[PDB]
Amino acid sequence: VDTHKLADDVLQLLDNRIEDNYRVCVILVGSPGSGKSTIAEELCQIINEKYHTFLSEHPNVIEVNDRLKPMVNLVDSLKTLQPNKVAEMIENQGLFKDHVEDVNFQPVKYSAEECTAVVARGGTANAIRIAASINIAQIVPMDGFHLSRRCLDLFKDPQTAHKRRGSPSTFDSNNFLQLCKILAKTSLCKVSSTSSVFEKLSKTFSQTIPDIFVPGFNHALKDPTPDQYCISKFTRIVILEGLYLLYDQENWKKIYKTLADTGALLVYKIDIDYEATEERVAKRHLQSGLVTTIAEGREKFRSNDLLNGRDIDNHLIKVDNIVHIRNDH
């Protein structure tokens, strides 16, 4: 795939929506070993580099508006987890024992300078945090929303929960959807002769947009970790990458519509070279210790539809705006 061309398409949408959307979202889906992580980082970088180069010759172009307007309230629609329940949750290792598999459990907020935490069925481990050199593009990995291993222990059937970790049901889909709702709201708010997209965005940064912190995934501790990615008023391009952003089930299905409805969404789906991906994933499992030989790794890939991508392709939401891209090496 041509990442510079993706960068060009992203800037074109942003420019076209400059007056209607504070930020454009990009959805990038790929099965394990598809390389969505590197494509997203590369795209993100390219865009930021372009902006820095623009700033080089337009040194003082940046201005933050809406200084006399109130902050965009992102959590007003959520129920507040009363102080007593916050304590109970914290006491139970930051978990909600009776809702770990409840996809309909609604996210709740509470005050943790001040700072608002939004949690759902995964508890504190997948919390989104909202606050009271200049990069305009940021990535949002879905990995940070993996339910914690301790959360998986509370599943009615922990054994399968762990063995199948990485399946759609082992992520806090509730809170990821909530993150998307927050992003859409920060996009649909109300914005504000040149033709330069960078010039336009530089004069329209808004003081009303708070910093938003999202969890990341610590591959060493095999669990999610807090505030690894910050989306601020300067972030005008959000690149969400993951396995189930286009999955037609439960909360995942609502993701596309939630971001699509902003009118500022680009969607990409990576089509994998089977053999190359099989080898890649087989080697990863070997290096991680999951298998003793590459042959075992390959068979695991072939028989696990969560690994070979079949599950994702079978559950790909039916929308005509999904741009299929290749990442062959």
Side-chain angles (χ1 to χ4, degrees), residues 73-93:
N73 195 316
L74 306 174
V75 300
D76 62 68
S77 301
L78 301 185
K79 152 190 167 57
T80 298
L81 184 61
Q82 300 307 311
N84 58 300
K85 295 177 299 178
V86 177
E88 188 189 310
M89 168 192 80
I90 295 301
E91 187 161 297
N92 295 313
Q93 313 308 79

Side-chain angles (χ1 to χ4, degrees), residues 100-326:
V100 299
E101 302 176 71
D102 183 12
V103 305
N104 270 193
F105 180 64
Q106 295 304 305
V108 295
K109 68 181 175 190
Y110 67 84
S111 295
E113 20 55 55
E114 77 176 307
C115 178
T116 303
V118 178
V119 292
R121 82 182 213 262
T124 57
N126 305 124
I128 294 170
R129 292 194 171 67
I130 310 174
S133 176
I134 297 296
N135 297 306
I136 56 173
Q138 177 60 290
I139 62 171
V140 171
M142 198 185 86
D143 292 293
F145 292 75
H146 266 91
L147 295 174
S148 69
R149 294 175 303 162
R150 171 166 286 81
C151 192
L152 294 182
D153 290 325
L154 302 175
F155 271 50
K156 202 59 187 177
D157 175 36
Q159 74 181 310
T160 298
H162 285 94
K163 191 279 180 59
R164 202 174 189 181
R165 190 178 202 193
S167 71
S169 68
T170 56
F171 285 87
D172 189 338
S173 64
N174 310 38
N175 226 207
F176 193 81
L177 170 56
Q178 185 55 46
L179 171 55
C180 292
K181 287 183 179 179
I182 284 171
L183 293 176
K185 190 169 181 177
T186 58
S187 173
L188 294 165
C189 48
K190 155 191 5 224
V191 178
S192 180
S193 64
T194 179
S195 55
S196 171
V197 61
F198 296 141
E199 177 80 50
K200 294 172 189 177
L201 69 80
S202 294
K203 299 297 189 182
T204 56
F205 286 118
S206 181
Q207 193 55 60
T208 63
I209 302 296
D211 290 333
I212 299 174
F213 299 84
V214 303
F217 192 75
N218 183 305
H219 286 288
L221 297 180
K222 330 298 174 59
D223 270 321
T225 179
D227 323 320
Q228 301 294 136
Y229 306 96
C230 178
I231 299 166
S232 73
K233 66 171 62 56
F234 294 114
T235 314
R236 304 296 280 286
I237 297 171
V238 182
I239 305 160
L240 301 93
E241 60 93 358
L243 297 161
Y244 313 116
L245 308 186
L246 299 171
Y247 205 77
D248 66 18
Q249 295 301 301
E250 47 135 317
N251 294 146
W252 304 113
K253 186 174 185 174
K254 302 174 184 177
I255 289 175
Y256 171 76
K257 172 168 178 53
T258 301
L259 301 184
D261 289 340
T262 60
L265 172 72
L266 278 177
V267 182
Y268 301 103
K269 197 284 183 178
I270 300 172
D271 289 333
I272 67 171
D273 176 294
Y274 196 86
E275 279 292 358
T277 303
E278 181 190 75
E279 181 188 70
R280 185 172 301 95
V281 174
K283 292 186 180 179
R284 291 185 183 175
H285 288 42
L286 179 62
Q287 311 175 325
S288 305
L290 287 59
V291 298
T292 73
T293 64
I294 192 78
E296 282 159 38
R298 294 174 177 291
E299 180 53 59
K300 178 176 180 181
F301 178 83
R302 296 180 301 188
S303 65
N304 193 332
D305 288 341
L306 289 177
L307 294 177
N308 54 45
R310 294 186 182 188
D311 192 65
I312 291 174
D313 289 335
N314 294 338
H315 288 281
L316 197 64
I317 60 174
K318 304 292 184 181
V319 300
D320 53 292
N321 290 170
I322 302 177
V323 176
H324 288 67
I325 55 176
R326 303 287 304 188

